[PDB]
Amino acid sequence: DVEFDALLGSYCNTLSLVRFLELGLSVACVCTKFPELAYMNEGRVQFEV
Amino acid sequence: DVEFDALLGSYCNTLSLVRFLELGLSVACVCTKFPELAYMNEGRVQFEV
Numbered sequence: 001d002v003e004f005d006a007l008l009g010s011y012c013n014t015l016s017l018v019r020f021l022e023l024g025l026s027v028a029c030v031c032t033k034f035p036e037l038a039y040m041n042e043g044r045v046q047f048e049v
Numbered sequence: 050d051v052e053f054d055a056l057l058g059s060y061c062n063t064l065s066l067v068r069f070l071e072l073g074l075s076v077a078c079v080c081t082k083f084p085e086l087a088y089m090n091e092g093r094v095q096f097e098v
Binding site: 004 | 088089090091092093094095096097098
């Protein structure tokens with residue numbers, strides 16, 4: 001009498017990653033990198049209306 | 050006078066035999082053949098997510 005325990009497979013998933021600009025939400029944001037942002041103190045925007 | 054009897058027919062039952070690959074059931078399982086499963090003791094599959 002012979003006996004064996006069989007390991008018959010496994011399946012990983014691809015952890016898919018989205019872009020955030022490959023997405024319809026990103027019309028509402030103007031995302032611009034300001035890479036000195038820590039060194040900023042206070043900023044204003046002008047509006048002549 | 051003449052007198053007899055007439056066996057006026059006898060008809061058989063045609064048996065249809067299924068094949069199980071020509072079904073919508075086959076989409077649900079993975080038919081794999083493995084001649085040593087009586088020699089198998091336990092079977093394990095581990096998964097990754």
